């Protein structure tokens, strides 16, 4: 996410290379059958290692929070949704991209 | 050979190969032979065999 940040001494030894960073993902909407490239906002839970969640590691089955403002989903209150969970459904390490399905 | 068939062969006096014994048929004895089938050939002898 942020261009420059200062990390705690806990994690100041885990170096994450530039080439392995991703900012967007191909996210599929199950109900409205379409997929749009949506930016990634935050990593919520990596169900393999709590450290990976803190480090932002994107593996298969990882829950991420994405910006769904372009799709224009209308909530029960009549507002337009701006952020929803999405589960990565691929292996970004083997396939040079992130694919997710929206949890809607 | 598993330990269970080993004990039965000792109880039937079948210590070496081509050893023969006479057994009277009985549910006590019938089940014993049925466990040592992969090692024994048995049947009903006639008067000439006896």
């Amino acid at each position: 996410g942020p261009d420059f940040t200062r990390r705690p001494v806990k994690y100041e030894r885990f170096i994450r290379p530039m080439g392995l960073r991703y900012k967007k993902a191909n996210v599929t909407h199950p109900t409205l059958n379409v997929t749009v490239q949506l930016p990634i906002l935050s990593v919520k839970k990596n169900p393999s290692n709590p450290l990976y969640t803190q480090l932002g590691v994107l593996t298969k089955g990882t829950i991420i929070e994405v910006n769904v403002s372009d799709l224009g989903i209308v909530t029960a209150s009549g507002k337009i949704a701006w952020g929803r969970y999405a589960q990565i459904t691929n292996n970004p390490e083997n396939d040079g991209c992130v694919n997710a399905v929206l949890l809607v | 050979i598993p330990p269970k068939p080993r004990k039965i062969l000792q109880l039937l006096r079948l210590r070496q190969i081509n050893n023969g014994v006479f057994v009277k048929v009985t549910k006590a004895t019938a089940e014993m032979i049925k466990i040592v089938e992969p090692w024994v050939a048995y049947g009903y002898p006639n008067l000439k065999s006896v």
């Binding site: 199950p30 919520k44 839970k45 169900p47 393999s48 089955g61 829950i63 929070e65 909530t75 029960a76 209150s77 507002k79 337009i80 949704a81 701006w82 952020g83 929803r84 969970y85 589960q87 949890l103 809607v104 | -």
Partner: protein, 66 residues
């Protein structure tokens, strides 16, 4: 000395138990995520942005409120 002697001979068994437990935690986490997937698909009721609390209380609250 006594405590190290138990750590002496139980060391490898604790290794395998830890691996088994970590795999189990993976299964429960994926189950809870999969349970949320069914609930949203069946019905639900959200706001504009997702809940600010961590992704263990938020899932527990949502699966409880039904």
């Amino acid at each position: 000395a006594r405590k190290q002697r138990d750590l002496k001979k139980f060391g490898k068994a604790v290794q395998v138990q830890k691996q088994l437990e970590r795999a189990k935690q993976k299964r429960e986490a994926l189950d809870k995520i999969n349970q949320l997937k069914r609930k949203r698909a069946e019905g639900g009721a959200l706001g504009a942005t997702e809940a600010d609390d961590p992704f263990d209380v938020a899932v527990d609250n949502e699966l409880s409120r039904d």
